[PDB]
Design a protein around this ligand. Structure first.
Ligand code: CU
Length: 620
């Protein structure tokens, strides 16, 4: 009954029939993106209208379309042709991935390059990578992938241990032709294997680990109704799933006594960029927008009980569309469970004789995606005390290269002759705020040091200041860890019992933002990654910080273009965009498979409640 329910297999079949009956989904058509649209802004929005947005690719070379359909009417609402040279190519299709290796295997330049290295072509895997926008005019308007080669000594061999440096090819995957093959010289192919299930590398497994059993003999404390609506320890929200963004959180709210108080209207990771910092021509074009170009949702893993998710697990199995409009189920794609989180609050009072201890808990919503060599886990946490946290967990196999004789300033060595180029993993969280409702404002809070003098005679005082961001043109902010900079999102029209505006404080990790030169191609396509915090006035069509079509787009779209409208944000329907990321200088311990590293952010209440909201937690 809820308009935020997950898309069903039946709705996706219906979309397929509608597009077919309308003549839009012929044999040469492919769905490159399909997802449900959010309900438009309407406090009394009654008539449900499940609409879906579709990107339709044409394998014949015809122009692609963006289409919106109403499954709640059986009709097509809109259909537009796209000029991809102007506004960007569609996201990469899964079936295009393998074409790169097969096209290259019959190309004379490629085989000549392999023969000079004594490589057997049937043993050479090609990683199909997004192309970006650089100095090649012939690529404009065409759908291009680039390919780097790795040797697989046998079918179960880890190819990442054997990169073929000095070689790269570009491929047009619509016309199926190899545009270029570049060979800058031969490097030895690193010989050691990186097979982390081979007993000769692992040695005998440990026998010292005894089991940890986590059970809930009365089942979990949260309830799921309507497929995806969660209630847990005064929290209320809907778990959505989009093939591009992955897990999305809707209608995050908290039951403060009698009333349900909104906090966040929609929360998602709206983009993710991985820029590489190796200046070699073989790799200096390498940047993937895993969300915008590949769609992290469609590579979600099925999560195995006891290995990926431990405890009393409730699963969601979201449904997406394949390239032809048939429903595909991701079995066990989302884990939800609650977990113990240590002491919540504690005090032993000498004067009163009362000893008081309460334990904390968090609700966990997670999924895991695999893109080529990388694996990323996405974790949302909700705590008893009203804190919201996001955590990214990065693992997988590092992207490799040769390690040059004589060292490198932009690559680290993992093994004899084997290198790993420096790179970043940078995320953009889109937080459509609704602190006690939709009239919100953002203030920047800095610590203020005070000078010893009159009024401060002992030189101990210190303070803080808050600056209201009133217009979009002044709402592009950077971190300042040294002055304890945070940002407060408040509602100036909703006051707590002390007559203060209610609010939430955003705590950033203050990791470095995009390191590339501001004149570079990647600084233009990933402009959002150059600043820690952006605030925009809400609009229906401003969904992604890089725009709708990231693949091979020239740059500037998204946030810098939104901000230029200079709209009023002082007490309005606003959206916060937080950039945060990992700067990865790979280490020996990352090889042959890398332990998890983490980055994230959190929001804590700042005078939102009238007192601690966990006074009613029992002792247990
Ligand atoms: Cu990394």
């Amino acid at each position: 009954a809820s308009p935020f329910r997950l898309a069903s297999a039946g709705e996706i079949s219906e979309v397929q029939g509608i597009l077919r009956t309308a003549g839009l989904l012929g044999p040469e058509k492919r769905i490159a993106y399909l997802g449900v649209l959010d309900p438009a802004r309407g406090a009394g929005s009654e008539a449900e209208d499940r609409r879906f947005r579709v990107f339709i690719h044409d394998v014949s070379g015809a122009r692609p379309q963006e289409v919106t359909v109403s499954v709640t009417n059986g009709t097509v609402i809109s259909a537009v042709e796209l000029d991809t040279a102007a506004t960007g190519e569609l996201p990469v299709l899964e079936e295009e991935f393998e074409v790169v290796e097969q096209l290259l295997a019959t190309d004379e330049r490629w085989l000549k390059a392999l023969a000079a290295r004594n490589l057997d072509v049937s043993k050479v895997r090609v990683a199909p990578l997004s192309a970006g926008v650089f100095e090649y005019a012939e690529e404009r308007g065409r759908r291009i992938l680039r390919g780097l080669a790795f040797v697989q000594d046998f079918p179960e061999d880890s190819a990442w241990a054997h990169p073929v440096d000095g070689l790269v090819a570009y491929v047009d995957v619509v016309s199926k032709e190899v545009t270029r093959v570049i060979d800058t010289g031969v490097f030895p192919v690193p010989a050691e294997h990186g097979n982390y299930t081979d007993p000769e590398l692992t040695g005998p497994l440990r026998t010292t680990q005894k089991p940890i059993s986590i059970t809930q003999p009365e089942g979990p404390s949260f309830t799921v109704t309507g497929g995806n609506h969660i209630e847990w320890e005064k929290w209320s929200l809907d778990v959505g799933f989009d093939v591009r963004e992955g897990v999305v959180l809707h209608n995050i709210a908290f039951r403060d006594g009698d009333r349900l108080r909104p906090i966040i209207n929609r929360a998602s990771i709206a983009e993710m960029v991985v820029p590489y910092g190796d200046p070699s021509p073989i790799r200096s074009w390498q940047n993937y927008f895993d969300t915008g170009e590949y769609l992290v949702g469609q590579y979600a893993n099925s999560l195995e009980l006891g290995c990926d998710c431990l405890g009393d697990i409730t699963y969601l199995s979201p449904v997406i569309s394949d390239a032809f409009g048939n429903p595909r189920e991701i079995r066990n794609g989302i884990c939800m469970h609650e977990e113990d989180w240590g002491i919540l609050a504690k005090h032993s009072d000498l004067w009163s004789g009362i000893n008081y201890t309460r334990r904390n808990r968090r609700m966990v919503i997670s999924f895991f995606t695999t893109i080529g060599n990388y694996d990323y886990g996405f974790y949302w946490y909700l705590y008893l005390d009203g804190t919201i946290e996001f955590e990214a967990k990065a693992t997988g196999v590092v992207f490799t290269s040769a390690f040059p004789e004589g060292g490198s300033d932009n690559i680290s060595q993992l093994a004899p002759g084997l290198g790993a180029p420096f790179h970043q993993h940078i995320f953009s969280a889109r937080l459509d705020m609704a602190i006690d409702g939709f009239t919100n404002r953002v203030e920047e809070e800095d610590v203020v040091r005070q000078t010893m003098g009159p009024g401060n005679e002992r030189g101990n005082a210190f303070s803080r200041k808050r600056t209201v961001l009133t217009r979009e043109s002044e709402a592009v902010r950077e971190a300042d860890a040294r002055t304890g900079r945070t940002w407060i999102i408040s509602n100036p029209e909703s006051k707590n019992r002390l007559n203060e505006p209610v609010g939430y404080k955003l705590h950033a990790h203050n990791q470095p933002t995009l390191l590339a030169d501001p004149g570079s191609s990647i600084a233009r396509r990933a402009a959002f990654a150059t600043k820690d915090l952006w605030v925009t006035r809400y609009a229906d069509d401003e969904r992604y910080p890089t725009g709708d079509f990231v693949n091979q787009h020239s740059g500037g779209a998204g946030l810098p273009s939104y901000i230029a409208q200079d709209r009023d944000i002082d007490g309005q329907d606003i959206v916060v965009w937080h950039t945060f990321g990992l700067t990865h200088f790979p280490r020996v311990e990352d090889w042959p498979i890398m332990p998890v590293d983490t980055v994230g952010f959190k929001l804590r209440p700042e005078g939102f409640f009238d007192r601690s909201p966990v006074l009613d937690v029992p002792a247990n």
